[PDB]
């Protein structure tokens, strides 16, 4: 592997960097719930964040984790400020979309092998 | 005794036409979505009203130029008079006394 | 007559509890400029029926200072909000 | 300024989190070797000290604490 | 040396906050040795207007 990294070196500065920005998002859940005038319960906004970080824990490599940092670092520009007009935030909460079957027999009635 | 019935006509005709527009033909109980909208063609303004210095000095400066036109106001009544060397030389004083108050402030106005 | 009792009852727009209190100090500077016209009128009712012919220049001059006075006092009330943003008369630091 | 008053504050934090720890107010909960959590979930627990008793959580010490003994001891030389 | 007792404690007992003579009360504050400017808090994030699809 002959390529320079982005920020980290090996497995330790990376896995303290990802723990840094989690304390930003944990602080900046109960701000946007009134900064956009959106009416839900505040514990919903904290459940989505602790859901989202456990998704990517299958990585065995540096600078891939560092790539996800840059996306995670960027969103705190728009979210902590007011650049999303109430609608780009609420797309994480799929309220409209109908539930998927996800079990074998219910797929077999409706749909040609999804 | 009409001065005083020369204006209470004019204000009761004024308040008539506003309540036959704001009230009466109005009452919006249907859908009338008064949600979070109506925010003056914008969004949420989390900042309050900030102080602006260059728009305070415009208030005070006018007020001190407004006073001594009321001193200057009875100049046409000061014509049909007695001793008039006094009346001329005192009338010219206040205007210069208004003029110097420019020229001192005129060396520092700012972007007004 | 009764045109002097009202208004001498209306001179009690000082009333000193509401001449510096409570907070939003603009409410207190309000009745300092509103204490005039209880002096501008109470003079004007007396000079005018009793034909003095000369003292009626004094109600004209009564406004000219009290306008310039209160304008000075309003300059400093920006300076208390230039340092804070709120006037709030329960600001006190220099004891006595 | 009381050494026991900071042992108060550390020892009603943990069950106030409705997650893993079941009323274990021991000082010897050693947090993913005695108690048992995820590596991510401890990071929440440290953050509560800014508004509860007042604190900064400055540095890499949050990767180091791992027990409410060590939480009190770093608060101990922080204040008294 | 010998002459009298010009001791240190006569400066701190006269130590200037309020001169608590016969009791201790809600003292003022160790008043500033320089000219008096503690409360420096003057800042605002200026207005964020969008002259956008207006």
Lookup: tokens for C66? 């009290």
Total count of domains within chain D: 1
Taking a C-beta distance cutoff of 8 angstroms, is the pair C61, C49 a contact?
A: no
**Does residue C91 fall inside a structural domain?**
no
Q: Which domain holds residue C67?
A: 2-84
Instruction: List phi, psi (to 5°) of D67.
Output: -165, 145
Is D38 one of the catalytic residues?
Answer: yes
> What resolution in angstroms, rounded to 1 decimal?
3.8
Chain B contact set for A85 (CB, 8 A)? 43
Cα–Cα dist D24/D26, whole Å: 5
| Domain annotation covers residue C70 | yes
Please name the method used to determine this structure: cryo-EM
Contacts of C57 in chain B (CB under 8 A): none
Contact B44 A35 (CB under 8 A): yes
D71: buried, middle or exposed (CB in 10 Å: 19+, 13-18, 0-12)? buried
User: CA of A56: how far to CAs of A69, D42, E21, in Å?
Assistant: 12, 18, 70
Domain count, chain C: 1
Structure-token pair, residue A26:
């944990």
Cβ–Cβ below 8 Å for D40 and A54: yes
Residue B35, token pair as written in the block: 């949600």
Contact B39, A37 (CB under 8 A): no
Q: How far is B35 from chain A (nearest CA, A)?
A: 10
Task: State residue C13 phi and psi, 5-degree precision.
Answer: -110, 5
The answer to whether the beta carbons of residues D57 and D46 sit under 8 Å apart is yes
Could you tell me the two tokens for A32? 């946007």
Write out the DSSP string of D21-77. Answer: --S---TT--SSSSS---TTTHHHHHGGGTTSS-----SGGGGT--SHHHHHHHHHH
**What domains does chain B contain, in order, with CATH numbers?**
7-107 (1.20.58.1610)
Instruction: Write out the residue range of the structural domain in which residue D39 sits.
Output: 3-79
Beta-carbon separation of E45 and B47 below 8 A? yes
Q: Does B36 touch chain A (CB under 8 A)?
A: yes
Among the partner residues B41, B42, B50, nearest to E44 by beta-carbon distance: B50
Nearest-CA distance E42 → chain C (Å): 6
C15 domain-assigned? yes
Is C59 part of a structural domain of the chain? yes
Handedness of CA B4, B5, B6, B9 (dihedral sign): positive
State the sign of the Cα–Cα–Cα–Cα dihedral B6, B9, B12, B16: negative
| Tokens describing residue C41 | 């009128």
Which residues from B are below 8 Å from E45, CB to CB? 47
Interface test with C, best of B49, B56, B61, B72 (most C CBs within 10 A): B56
At C28, is the secondary structure helix, strand, or coil?
A: helix
């Amino acid at each position: 592997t002959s390529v320079k990294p982005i920020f980290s070196r090996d497995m330790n500065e990376a896995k303290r960097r990802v723990r840094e920005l989690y304390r930003a998002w944990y602080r900046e859940v109960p701000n946007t719930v009134h900064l956009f005038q959106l009416d839900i319960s505040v514990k919903q906004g904290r459940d989505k964040v602790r859901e989202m970080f456990k998704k990517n824990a299958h990585i065995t490599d540096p600078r891939v984790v560092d790539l996800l940092v840059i996306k995670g670092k960027m969103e705190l520009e728009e979210t902590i400020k007011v650049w999303k007009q109430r609608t780009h935030v609420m797309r994480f909460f799929h309220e409209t979309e109908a539930p998927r079957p996800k079990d074998f027999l219910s797929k077999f009635y409706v749909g040609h092998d999804p | 005794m009409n001065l005083m019935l020369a204006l209470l006509t004019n204000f009761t005709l004024a308040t008539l036409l506003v309540i036959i527009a704001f009230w009466l033909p109005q009452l919006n109980v249907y859908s009338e979505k008064t949600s979070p909208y109506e925010c003056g063609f914008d969004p949420m303004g989390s900042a309050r009203l900030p102080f602006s210095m260059k728009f305070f000095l415009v208030a005070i400066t006018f007020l001190l130029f407004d006073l001594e036109i009321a001193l200057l106001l009875p100049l046409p009544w000061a014509s049909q008079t007695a001793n008039l060397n006094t009346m001329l030389t005192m009338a010219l004083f206040l205007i210069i006394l208004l003029a110097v108050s420019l020229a001192y402030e005129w060396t520092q106005k700012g972007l007004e | 007559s009764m045109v002097y009792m009202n208004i001498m009852m209306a001179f009690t727009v000082s009333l000193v509890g509401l001449l510096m209190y409570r907070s939003h100090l603009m409410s207190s500077l309000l009745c300092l400029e509103g204490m005039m016209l209880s002096l501008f009128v109470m003079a004007a009712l007396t000079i005018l029926n009793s034909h003095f012919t000369l003292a009626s220049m004094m109600p004209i001059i009564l406004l000219v200072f009290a306008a310039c006075e209160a304008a000075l006092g309003l300059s400093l009330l920006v300076m208390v909000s230039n340092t804070y943003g709120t006037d709030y008369v329960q600001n006190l630091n220099l004891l006595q | 300024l009381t050494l026991e008053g900071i042992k108060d504050r550390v020892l009603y934090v943990l069950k106030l989190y409705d997650k893993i720890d079941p009323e274990k107010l021991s000082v010897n909960s050693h947090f993913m070797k005695d108690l048992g959590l995820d590596s991510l979930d401890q990071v929440e627990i440290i953050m509560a000290m800014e508004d509860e008793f007042g604190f900064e959580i400055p540095d890499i010490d949050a990767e180091k604490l791992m027990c409410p003994q060590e939480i009190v001891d770093y608060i101990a030389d922080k204040k008294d | 040396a010998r002459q009298w007792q010009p001791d240190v404690e006569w400066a701190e007992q006269y130590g200037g906050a309020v001169m608590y003579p016969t009791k201790e009360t809600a003292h003022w504050k160790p008043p500033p040795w320089n000219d008096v400017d503690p409360p420096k808090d003057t800042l605002v994030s200026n207005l964020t207007l969008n002259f956008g699809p207006q």
